[PDB]
Symmetry: none
Subunit: 139 residues, 10 copies
């Protein structure tokens, strides 16, 4: 069952990003805090939509896609990925990682249903690395 993040925490994090900036160690610590439980693509996408401005959000979408592509290359380079399965029918496509696959587009409940925990942690680590890249790039 999907539970959304508190809008109070999200508002506090947005104001933190607004006053301290993207690169302060306190901001990265707060992001790591709100990045503790494995989030669904819907959660991370809406979180970055709210806390980041338009141009940093575009940059972050780009960087997140690139990092997820690196993850999928490593996944096709190793059939023992915690997102993959043993047979070929469990291979994870980027539509399933970005939340674009069938039964997931716009629906967080179905998303949480079909996604694997390894998928969730890989998406989360990818999003964190992308946030780091964009923060280092913006300023």
């Amino acid at each position: 069952a999907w539970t959304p993040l508190e809008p109070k925490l999200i508002t506090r994090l947005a104001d933190t990003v607004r006053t301290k900036g993207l690169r302060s160690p306190i901001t990265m610590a707060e992001v790591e805090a709100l990045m503790s439980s494995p989030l669904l693509p819907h959660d991370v996408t809406n979180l970055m939509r709210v806390i980041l401005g338009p141009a940093p959000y575009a940059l972050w979408m780009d960087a997140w896609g690139v990092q997820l592509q690196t993850v999928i290359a490593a996944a096709t380079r190793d059939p023992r990925h915690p997102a993959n399965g043993q047979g070929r029918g469990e291979r994870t496509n980027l539509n399933r990682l970005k939340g674009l696959a069938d039964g997931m587009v716009g629906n967080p409940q179905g998303q949480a249903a079909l996604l694997r925990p390894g998928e969730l942690v890989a998406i989360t680590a990818s999003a964190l690395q992308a946030f780091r890249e964009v923060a280092r790039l913006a300023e």
Copy 2:
């Protein structure tokens, strides 16, 4: 058994709508948060009565009715609706969706008794879409120029905001943002983008390139 939403959360959401507005992404996130569990028509109706002003509330009632009517048309177009049943005696009328049916008018307990979970989730999704419509309606990309003294990240923020918060289809935003970066964004950056040895096919890539090679001043 029906449990009401906390008036503390409702007060915080009302003040959020009061300060940030109806269309801010933080406000939509908060509404999605308070729209997590399937609500009864009583809950959503009182919620919109409290958080919205009078005129937005009228607009929202209209939009909610229209969306529920579309849902009921799809329901009569498919007897396998999670709100419907298999026989004809379980067909769901708009009086049952809007909470106007018998045994439901003004009573949330009876409402929660007779309603289906599919009914609840359909009502909830309809109310969310209606809220989105009214928010887009209550409050121009092709008129945006980069000022002579404005930086490029501010111009990009303003342009992406106005393009994504507009009436364009989702599949037409990236090409429009790119072609607006190329034709707006005063001729120094125009020539900087024009003389790009690589082909830039994404707003993020254009922003990165321009931020790298921009004239520090």
Copy 3:
């Protein structure tokens, strides 16, 4: 008093509608007389540009929400 509410020369239409609906619903009228009064106050108040905008409505508007939506669509951006 609802019958003394006018749309100011510089006031937007959503503020005027909010003020009018507030004063009409928080008054001594019966519940079944609020919508017609709100409509007829939209038509006679709401300075003559919006008056003519509502008058020349190819469709018949029979609800305050519909009038508000129509006016917000076709209003003079300024």
Copy 4:
């Protein structure tokens, strides 16, 4: 048996390309006309050699090669191509498509002998798409404003021309044309479109409305 195209038609088409240009709809119609029967690589190659200048001819050779390579990738992705056969011995190489294979180099008769009709139609469609690409490449919508003295039909013509002859997807032209009518088209017509009692959802409808209610002057 191979029959050459008339040099009279080719001369008329060359003069059409010389006066009207590469991108005019009349020129594309004439090319479609002379592209009616499936042509051999020799025919299309000589045709483009005659009607196109040197630099457009180089560009067209490049684009034709790229499109033929896409065709051959689709062919190796499907053994049921009308150019392919069922066994592996009928697989079609780019030397056979470009006319470079054995028994074809410089000889149109042998070319017509060994080539398949599916091969011919694929080559022809590839050449047509390459011509379209080069024409779009050889010769900005967001910078178009209605001049203070310009009429509205001239502005609409110029805007629709620049929007349809651009890099936008086909499904994004109408919304862009509408939103450019609304934000360009100096504030008298802007207010005329804004105060439209009906909702205008098509460039033709907007043009009709504005032409009806325009300020005669």
Copy 5:
């Protein structure tokens, strides 16, 4: 088999429209002449693209759509339309009239294959009436 109209006739008609205008009786006679054989949607569309300017072409697309919609209303009002068939499986959709149906988009050969002669004559009459409307409207 589809045969294109001569670009010489089309060039002469375009220059006629350029000098005499859209509403002259000689121009309407020339259009009736080039509207003699039943044309495929591709032919009429390209013809109007070439002979008409951009704004008259937009107006003509609008008017042609409206007239085709009236035709389809009359067709659903009478199952004996020369474009329709007897069973319900031959009912003609606007995607088939405007050339947007499956197997027709951009391909005139397939267009000529699947289209009916009644379909062709209805499309042609609709296009002629739309041209008349736009000519009466432009000047």
Copy 6:
């Protein structure tokens, strides 16, 4: 004479390319020596703005058509 062709200060690039390809193909060179000559004439003629535009090409351009496409994409609109 192909080796005397320069891109004028006011001339566009497609006209210069047309003139150069015409003079090179209508000359006494062997057929297998026209493309390298056209490329090396694009690089050394074609006044220093386009010279630097071709020089700083992140990709390697090995055909006159590819050079023409690249230059037409990244040319200084003026």
Copy 7:
């Protein structure tokens, strides 16, 4: 003469409709040609404000009485 009847700049619409229907019914037209003529005279006479009011009718008006009712409903009170 019916074909010379125009709605004056200051004349109301009911007076114009009365005058036009009078002149059309008291003329040499066949009985089956009066309604279409009255409609098409409402559309082309009846100065451009009412012309545009009739033009932008979301419904199709197919009778002089219906046109009169519509115009009387949505007319610019002045």
Copy 8:
């Protein structure tokens, strides 16, 4: 047997409508007075032809038709209408209400013969409501 209304009363009512207007309470009282006995469609039609101008008469014909249609909808919604009968052969069509049915067109005697008293009172009430609508609309 049909008896016409006095032209003296009709002339006085016409002058009343001419001086006082359509909406004055005295005019509505006079109309109610001349609307006392159930009138045949011929009577009401000629009365409105005489007392009303051309444009109000067109409006009144429209409104009378609409009100009669509402009456016929209520009649098909209840087989116990004083205009209807018990069997289906007495169902009242709009041609019989507007006086357009067979044996009634232009003949008031035959009209009075075939019409029911319930038909007459329904026609009369419909005409009165239509007059009220048109009077409220004209000024």
Copy 9:
């Protein structure tokens, strides 16, 4: 000291590269840390014209030799 080496306003790029590679290889760094340091010093030193020239590299340069070749190709002849 390698971290104090800047490309002078009038110095050529091959002299700067020679000096920098000399000072980096004749220093106390481990052998496996010289190439990344030389690259990142090419990118941050080497006055902003060459900095932007390296930044806008359509290809990814992952070796000091490749960076030197690219810069020597696309450098501003002066």
Copy 10:
């Protein structure tokens, strides 16, 4: 048995490269002279380390690697390479060509022991072509 090149010849060649440059025909002739006997990877590597500056040496390492990779592609394209053998156990890896294989790293004696004469001549020709490329590139 490995015999080193004379440091006197190497010093003379280094001064030749210093005064005449990399591209002079006399310099290429001198390099061809000192490239007469098949050299071990150690010899050519130290020779280029001494005669070339730091940046030309980096360029030359790159070019030598690329040319050796082309050689190894031709070798896997033909099992009759004078560096290869008949069975698959004699296939020559780039670690054996660049002197990086086991028993060769830093030891010229072991290098000369395990290397083939075909290997030596291929390495030598590759190094000569790489020197030509770098000389054409440097000036």
